[PDB]
Design a protein around this ligand. Structure first.
Ligand code: NAG
Ligand code: NAG
Lengths: 370, 370, 50
């Protein structure tokens, strides 16, 4: 008897969640779980904390599956703080909870769905070596994990036979006052036909407006951006130049009713696995106030059993930082008008694009030989 | 117009002192005083602080440590809650190096310097006594890593690499094997930056191995010279101290002064908008605080009880005062001061460990090679 | 690890050099058996020799 709660923010098909809760086979595992669904708005951190406290005090909740619809990022940090304070684990399946955080402390029970910065950096180079763009430059601002991105990018390209000639790096800071002139002067140093960017949505919009003022965004330069710049597919800032390439999680074929079942299955299978061998189960009085003395029963073993699970012929083996190790990504391109289209999806490290030659969007010639 | 600030203290008498200080500063656009107490849990702290954030729509928050010894988690709720709104926060008695990280804590300022500057002032002793070869041991923690990195970065200019860097796991009870390796080495200067508990473990093991005889030098810091370490502590240890570290009234008497100069230059510049008082209501970011941080950090303060206070581009106080603190015959006596960038002697004479009265070379020539 | 005795152009040069400077020595061969280059370990930023 383990209680699991699910929290939704914003509009969602509530009846679909109820129908899909009992959608898998959970008979041969002694979990007998109960599903509790509660809906609330995005009022504030205080409301979220109060709701979580009330729920965990109400009926024997040992874990929370959290959903969200807004694109805010600090909600992940707040949830990580809560998970650090109380030993119960929580899961982020969609929304702002899917954003990757800087560095979870050594005592946090918190996991997210979605690739990290390093895997997206790796795929940005797998995309490059297929349409033969061997010349590129990188520009980025101050964001958590910015050093890891450039470090991995530089490490990958210096241990291969193919020749990547990296033309200068830019780590400009846009938070300075009256530094816009300096930023505009520095942006003129870019010469490679391929540009890599790592910035927040508003930072990306400001930088793109500045670049369009300079004019190096019209015909021959192509930009590649990470997942977090998009955030919401529908909300097009209208400042993004045509031809932008981005990598995003496959939300088109993987909506939400399946994610709830997948998240519940992780907890159920982990609890079943840790119960049988160890003949124990963490069932403390999950108090809300005066929780410093409630840390008597260590749940670190449950954490060790949370990082290696599988079900229905799928791999969900996590890592030390708390992310997939095996996500399912897609590649999206912004066409002539403001809209996003699927170009190619790759699984198990095998790139598969639906195009063979990049559509150009005259001094481009053809050569025949023998 | 009317502008109000906020603060949280750990004593009702301290609250009255803060009220008296703000009443005195009113003679220098009228200010206000808001203060609350501390709770033994972080979630209640966050709930109260955003509840009290709604109370008066504060512009700056002052935080102080409680009588608890560790208090490592006490500043965390306020920092997270304030950074959720990008509201700058000034700290008074926080010394852990975690809060110096600009990534997790975007808005945070320090009234006292961190331990990294202690590691930096360790350099002047070597500079003035011609000690070029040292052995340093630090614990496996985020605290030690920053100090080691800063020390080796500072020593990079001198092009004098330390011979050995060795570490031990935190919270251990046996370090005999590790101390064995350093005994074989050829350096006689030991610098340790560990926790208070680990200070007792290392000091006990050093005595057994005859490690603290003649011809040895120990350079320690604030944490391992206080506490229960003096129960088992050899003579001749050279420590460190701060002139006005523990006088919370001295800081407060001028902490409100430096912020008062900043608001004068901000209230009449442009586009001033009060940060929202809607704890529950608004979830956006206040426009005021990206520019407020820039002006505040560069606000030079002419003169104060602790001298000139000028902030670098790190949110940490610069030009602190250190007293080279010495122990002889089971009591501590001052022997010098750290004048900003250099040191001067004093009337008293330092007695080195082992009873010898000289300046040990810190070197023992070896006559066997490999 | 079994004791062995070595001799050659380098060994007797060391003997003559050692007698001048009044020091002793205890030679031992390398374990891996390579001259040494830089390598990337465990796919990390740091690099170490062999
Ligand atoms: C305090 C303690 O446990 N000391 C022991 C020491 O006596 C022993 O020689 C060494 C060998 O591993 O291990 C350690
Ligand atoms: C510190 O040393 C300098 C020497 O450059 C001296 O002028 C000054 O008076 C000393 N004391 C202080 C407080 O600066």
């Amino acid at each position: 008897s383990i209680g699991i709660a699910v929290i939704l923010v914003g509009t969602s098909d509530e009846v679909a969640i109820k129908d899909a809760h009992e959608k898998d086979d959970f008979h041969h595992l002694s979990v007998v779980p109960r599903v509790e669904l509660v809906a609330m708005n995005e009022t504030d951190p205080k409301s979220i904390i109060t709701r979580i406290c009330d729920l965990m005090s109400d009926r024997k909740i040992q874990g929370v599956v959290f959903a969200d619809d807004t694109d805010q990022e600090a909600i992940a940090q707040i949830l990580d703080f809560i998970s650090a304070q109380t030993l119960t684990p929580i899961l982020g399946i969609h929304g702002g909870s899917s954003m990757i955080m800087a560095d979870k402390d050594e005592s946090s029970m918190f996991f997210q769905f979605g690739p990290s910065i390093e895997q997206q950096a790796s795929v940005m180079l797998n995309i490059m070596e297929e349409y033969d763009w061997y010349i590129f430059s990188i520009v980025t601002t101050y964001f958590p994990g910015y050093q890891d991105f450039v470090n991995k990018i530089r490490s990958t390209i210096e241990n291969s036979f193919v020749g990547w000639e990296l033309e200068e790096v830019l780590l400009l800071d846009m938070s300075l006052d009256d530094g816009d002139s300096k930023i505009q002067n520095q942006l003129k140093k870019l010469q490679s036909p391929i540009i890599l960017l790592y910035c927040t949505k508003e930072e990306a919009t400001y930088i793109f407006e500045v670049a369009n003022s300079v004019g190096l965004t019209g015909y021959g330069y192509t930009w590649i951006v990470p997942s977090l710049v998009a955030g919401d597919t529908d909300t097009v800032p209208s400042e993004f130049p045509t031809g932008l390439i981005s990598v995003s999680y496959d939300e088109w074929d993987y909506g939400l009713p399946a994610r709830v079942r997948d998240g519940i299955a992780i907890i159920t299978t982990a609890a079943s696995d840790m119960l049988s061998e160890h003949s124990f189960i963490p069932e403390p009085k999950s108090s809300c106030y005066n929780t410093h003395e409630k840390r008597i029963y260590q749940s670190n073993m449950l954490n060790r059993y949370l990082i290696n699970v599988t079900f229905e012929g799928r791999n969900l083996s996590f890592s030390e930082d708390g992310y997939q190790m095996h996500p399912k990504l897609v590649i999206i391109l912004l066409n002539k008008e403001r809209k996003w289209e699927r170009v190619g999806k790759w699984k198990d490290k095998s790139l598969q694009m639906k195009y063979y030659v990049w559509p150009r969007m005259d001094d481009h010639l053809s050569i025949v030989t023998l | 117009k009317i502008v109000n600030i906020g603060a949280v203290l750990s004593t009702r008498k301290h609250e009255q002192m803060f009220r008296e200080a703000v009443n005195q500063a009113n003679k220098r656009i009228q200010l206000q005083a808001t203060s609350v107490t501390h709770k033994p849990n972080a979630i209640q702290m966050a709930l109260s602080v955003c509840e009290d954030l709604i109370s008066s729509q504060v512009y700056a928050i002052l935080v102080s440590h409680p009588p608890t010894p560790n208090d490592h988690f006490t500043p965390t709720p306020v920092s997270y809650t304030a950074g959720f709104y990008r509201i700058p926060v000034l700290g008074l008695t926080t010394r852990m190096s975690i809060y110096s990280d600009k990534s997790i804590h975007l808005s945070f300022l320090r009234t006292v310097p961190p331990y990294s500057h202690q590691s930096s002032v360790w350099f002047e002793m070597m500079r003035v006594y011609n000690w070029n070869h040292i052995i340093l041991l630090v614990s496996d923690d985020h605290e030690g890593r920053a100090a080691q990195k800063r020390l080796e970065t500072l020593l990079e200019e001198r092009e004098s690499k330390a011979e050995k860097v060795l570490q031990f796991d935190p919270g251990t009870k046996n370090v005999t094997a590790l101390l064995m390796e350093a005994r074989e080495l050829e350096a006689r200067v030991i610098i340790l930056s560990a926790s208070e508990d680990d200070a007792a473990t290392v000091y006990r093991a050093a005595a057994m191995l005859d490690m603290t005889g003649s011809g040895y030098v120990w350079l320690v810091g604030e944490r391992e010279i206080s506490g229960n370490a003096l129960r088992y502590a050899p003579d001749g240890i050279i420590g460190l101290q701060l002139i006005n570290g523990k006088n919370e009234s001295a800081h407060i008497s001028d902490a409100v002064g430096v912020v008062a100069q900043a608001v004068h230059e901000l209230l009449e510049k442009e586009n001033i908008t009060d940060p929202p008082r809607g704890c529950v209501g608004n979830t956006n970011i206040w426009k005021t605080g990206p520019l407020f941080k820039r002006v505040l950090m560069s606000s030079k303060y002419a003169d104060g009880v602790t001298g000139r206070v000028e902030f670098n581009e790190d949110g940490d106080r610069k030009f602190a005062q250190y007293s080279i603190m010495n122990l002889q015959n089971r009591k501590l006596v001052q022997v010098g001061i750290y004048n900003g960038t250099h040191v001067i002697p004093n009337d008293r004479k330092i007695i080195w460990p082992g009873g010898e009265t000289e300046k040990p070379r810190g070197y023992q020539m070896s006559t066997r090679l490999k | 690890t079994v004791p062995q005795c070595c001799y050659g152009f380098c060994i007797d040069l060391l003997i003559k050099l050692a007698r001048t400077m009044q020091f002793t020595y205890e030679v031992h061969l390398v374990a891996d058996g390579k001259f040494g280059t830089q390598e990337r370990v465990q796919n990390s930023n740091k690099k170490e020799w062999n």
